Amino acid sequence: PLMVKVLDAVRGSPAINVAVHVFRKAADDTWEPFASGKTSESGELHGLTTEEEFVEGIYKVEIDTKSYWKALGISPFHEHAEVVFTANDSGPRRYTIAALLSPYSYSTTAVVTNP
Amino acid sequence: PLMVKVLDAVRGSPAINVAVHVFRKAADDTWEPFASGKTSESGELHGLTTEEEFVEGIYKVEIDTKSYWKALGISPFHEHAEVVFTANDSGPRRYTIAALLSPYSYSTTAVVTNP
Amino acid sequence: PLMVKVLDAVRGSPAINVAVHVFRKAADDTWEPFASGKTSESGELHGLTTEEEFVEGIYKVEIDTKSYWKALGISPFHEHAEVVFTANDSGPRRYTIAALLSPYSYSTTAVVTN
Amino acid sequence: PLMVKVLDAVRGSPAINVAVHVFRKAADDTWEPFASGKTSESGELHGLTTEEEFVEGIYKVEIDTKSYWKALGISPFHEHAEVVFTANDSGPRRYTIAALLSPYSYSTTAVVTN
Ligand SMILES: COc1cccc(OC)c1/C=C/c1cc(Br)c(N)c(Br)c1
């Protein structure tokens, strides 16, 4: 129900080995760790959560772009890219969070489908 | 060897039923029709060409964004999005041309892999 | 030393009257208010800080995209757009943070000049 | 009535000295030269046309991205970036075409104002 896709706008490739941390806003308004992983050789990260676990809430998907660029050699502008959204508030949906990375820029989109 | 992926930044969905026309620059410097198709329900268009057919050259992938937006109801800025690139000049590669559409904007990227 | 520019990809216009909040990361890892404002008719927000106050550190620029879309009667995906970066003195002097907004997507870049 | 703004997503800067060629679609469906120039130090190109000359029609703005990247010693994907649009009098008066460049990608938007 939650997938992340990351592309590299410099290389024209998937962004591989990108760390991703997901948080969910708690009752007390803190950001609780929810899940985490790394993108694959295809720039994809699946298996973050289950439909049972992925309840309604406000989620933050933090993509560790700095760590990606620095592992490359390369000094980027942003600390990370954070994507924050309400999920599942009209029932369960499947979410793909995509990001396209450059050293001083990124774009992000969502694909939301109703299974 | 040539795939096209189109997303809709307004709806948060694949861009379905988008017409795509591919041209290849000829010896005489004209743009010859090469292939064409429509995106699927997943916003993807496969089956445009074969490795045999997809020789070295300068290719133009014209994504008919205006027709997409107008079929929607909706009056957009651009006539189309054109993606022009040299392909296969270091031997065969697989190319994915992606576009993310809004009424007054688009972004495009390439994913190039060596099979 | 710090400017924000916001554009609207649906209407082909500056994004006007967008709330923007800037925070600086404190020693205890919390985010403290730094500057805020609303974008102008040109989608710009100037006058956020001065050279004196804008010291090296980690800053967050939070753009209230949800309220922007809702005011236009459009349903959006994101709660906000967040741009988090380090200001570094050995780089050029002026930072412009730009964002290009759509309901389910945004783009952001930095223009850092001398 | 027509301005072009080009930014560099790798270096976080204006894209300076980029060649830009503007064409207008002729009655016979060919593209005829209209205006050209090179972006300034601020990544801008002004002075392309006048209100008198910039009549309704289909225009193409071709940004020579390949030469830009090659001059920086970087290998790029695209031959150029093409932006094709109709100018319509019943819309706002001034058109700004912006582009944000990376070696294997670009973004473009229009800001159309009165
Ligand atoms: C879900 O997204 C995908 C899934 C599979 C394959 C894909 O491309 C090969 C994509 C592309 C995503 C994408 C994201 C952003 Br942001 C921009 N700007 C662009 Br252009 C494209």
Ligand SMILES: COc1cccc(OC)c1/C=C/c1cc(Br)c(N)c(Br)c1
């Ligand atoms: C008219 O545009 C401008 C005028 C003055 C200053 C500007 O930034 C400092 C801009 C930004 C343009 C812009 C274009 C794209 Br395409 C994307 N993706 C992004 Br983000 C931003």
